[PDB]
Amino acid sequence: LIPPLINLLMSIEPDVIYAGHDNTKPDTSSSLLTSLNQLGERQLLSVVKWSKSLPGFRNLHIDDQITLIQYSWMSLMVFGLGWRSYKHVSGQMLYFAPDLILNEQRMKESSFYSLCLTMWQIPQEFVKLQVSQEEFLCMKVLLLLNTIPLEGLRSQTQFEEMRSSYIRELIKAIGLRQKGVVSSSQRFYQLTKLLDNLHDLVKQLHLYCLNTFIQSRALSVEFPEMMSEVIAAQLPKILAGMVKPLLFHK
């Protein structure tokens, strides 16, 4: 049967989040980007709410909690996108929200299309690996815990205990299906290498975000208030490499 912590993770998953996209009039790049930003503002709230129910997290110093969220928001959102796209449309469209699903036709702008192809590697890997919901839920928590400041965290001990606990839980998740030590271990390698590889992908999304943000008035792209602050607070420092990404492999 399903381990308790995984059952809890399932129960604290956010409910479906709508973009609120005006689905009548057609896409310009800038209107589509505004909708994505509006959706991202709703997803950020939902990430912050989720984190308050996530076992272990609230017990870290409040500054660590804020930092871990500001560092991981993009990863969490690309990972969420991959899962939904995998689950709902067999990884063959980008399922941002039920009212915002993008197929190839709706990605005109080449820079944005390039970005979408990059994000698309995640749903493709989920399909290839056949990631279970149980593995995903533990992987997601490890993403929240996958980048820390160069100095480390105020609650460094508690943080490392928490990360360890979700790594064991992922190994439990893997065991639900993957029987046998060699298959289990190869599977662990694969899923944690996927997490390692997300740092690279996410760096491209970070740069595109800060660019679009600085140029927002020239592009007519709207950035809501909470998103604007996470970007202003941390994105230049993150892009400048002034953070320590955690890696499962050398």
Ligand SMILES: Cc1noc(C)c1-c1ccc(CNS(=O)(=O)c2c(C)nn(C)c2Cl)cc1
């Ligand atoms: C929402 C959502 N779901 O997955 C992703 C990725 C998002 C998302 C994440 C971040 C942002 C911030 N603005 S943005 O740079 O213009 C951007 C990024 C980064 N990705 N996308 C799809 C956009 Cl628009 C907007 C949407």
